[PDB]
């Protein structure tokens, strides 16, 4: 009877950088997947697992929104089994991911003249993401033998780096906003249903 | 944009030299400046790279200790001070800007100058 | 520092024809390969920066490839003012090693 906060995951005003990607959990609602799939505005609609038409009645305990914005170029790498610097450093889904991805075109909302360089994503990394790890810290990455201590130096560099988003780059360089949808089961009853 | 060199030629080994190179086209004080050397028939071997803040200095093997980049921006030109050269030091040096890019992982060497022959052999 | 080996050192290739030069790495240097080109007793000529974007003004047949540890060079139709030796630089970790270099014959 109570309709799931859908609108404000796929309507949310700021969205998070790909590195400090929010996850919104949904539970003790009623989810329709039918204004999600039908809108007719969604470029990337593809669900792993579960087939898109039939999860409007699977029910499912907890339901993680995990939302964030990328490059158009970069949409492959949200999927299980993707080798890349998003799918590598920033946001890592399980190889048997049981969700959906969904990807839309942000030109629009996102893509200041000057250059929109609000959005961070992590170029380097120690070791590959564990899937659904959120690593925030902004710690010197050390790419040679000498120790940084610190500092921002030749083989020492800062992992983050600005999206550069403007308003002709082409559809690859552009922004899309990514909300990924984990649908999970465990002893607990079913919350989540439509 | 040009970058002219200058100050090579012959050398005894052991001895030291001073290579100038002279920037014109740009404004000086904005862009690191390397020194990449190319000795006969072989490849490109970098040699030395200087920040744009003038405190961050890089320098290859078997150049390091030696070799001392600088740059007075106020003048316009960069140097580097061959000190104690050997014989492996032969080659054509090219003073290289690098790109207005302000990070250290990322640079490439836009515009080059035309080369400088150091000969060490005595 | 990151080893460069660039293959072939040497491609003969005519007119019209395409040249494909691959330069590999001994450790990942992600997307920061540079392409330069050195015609004989000239200095070196900026092509490919970020292993694919192509210098302003530079003729468009040239491209790059590569991600990691393999990247490649394109020439669609080798021109008659495109021989010369292409080297290939890494700029993720200083210093910046070119490769040997390959030079394009008749």
């Known amino acids: 009877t109570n309709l799931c906060p859908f609108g404000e995951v796929f309507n949310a005003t700021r969205f998070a950088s790909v590195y400090a990607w929010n996850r919104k959990r949904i539970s003790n609602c009623v989810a329709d997947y039918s204004v999600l799939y039908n809108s007719a505005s969604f470029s990337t609609f593809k669900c792993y697992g579960v087939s898109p038409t039939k999860l409007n009645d699977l029910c499912f305990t907890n339901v993680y929104a995990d939302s964030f914005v990328i490059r158009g170029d970069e949409v492959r790498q949200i999927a299980p089994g993707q080798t890349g610097k998003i799918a590598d450093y920033n946001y890592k889904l399980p190889d048997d991911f049981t969700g959906c991805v969904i990807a839309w075109n942000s030109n629009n909302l996102d893509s200041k003249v000057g250059g929109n360089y609000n959005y961070l994503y992590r170029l380097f990394r120690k070791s590959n993401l564990k899937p659904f790890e959120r690593d925030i810290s902004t710690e010197i990455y050390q790419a040679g033998s000498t120790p940084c201590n610190g500092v921002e130096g030749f083989n020492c560099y800062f992992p983050l780096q600005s999206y550069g988003f403007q308003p002709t780059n082409g559809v690859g360089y552009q922004p899309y906003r990514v909300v990924v949808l984990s649908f999970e089961l465990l002893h607990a009853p079913a919350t989540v249903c439509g | 944009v040009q970058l002219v060199e200058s100050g090579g030629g012959v050398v005894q080994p052991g001895r030291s030299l001073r290579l100038s190179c002279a920037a014109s086209g740009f404004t000086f004080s904005s862009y690191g400046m390397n020194w990449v050397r190319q000795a006969p028939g072989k490849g490109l071997e970098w040699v030395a790279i200087i920040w744009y803040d003038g405190n961050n200095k890089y320098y290859v093997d078997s150049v390091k200790g030696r070799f001392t980049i600088s740059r007075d921006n106020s003048k316009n030109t960069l140097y580097l001070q061959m000190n104690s050269l050997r014989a492996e030091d032969t080659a054509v040096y090219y003073c290289?800007?690098?790109?207005?890019?302000?990070?250290?992982?990322?640079?490439?060497?836009?515009?080059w100058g035309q080369g400088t022959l150091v000969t060490v052999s005595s | 520092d990151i080893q460069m080996t660039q293959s072939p050192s040497s491609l003969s290739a005519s007119v019209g024809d395409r040249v494909t030069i691959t330069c590999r790495a001994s450790?990942?240097?992600?997307?920061?390969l540079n392409w330069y080109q050195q015609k004989p007793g000239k200095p070196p000529n900026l092509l490919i920066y970020a292993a694919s974007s192509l210098q302003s003004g530079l003729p468009s047949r040239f491209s790059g490839s590569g991600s990691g540890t393999d990247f490649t060079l394109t020439i669609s139709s080798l021109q008659p003012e495109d021989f010369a030796t292409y080297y290939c630089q890494q700029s993720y970790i200083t210093p910046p090693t070119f490769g040997h270099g390959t030079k394009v014959e008749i």
């Open positions: 290289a800007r690098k790109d207005y890019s302000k990070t250290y992982y990322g640079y490439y060497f836009d515009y």
């Open positions: 450790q990942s240097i992600h997307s920061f």
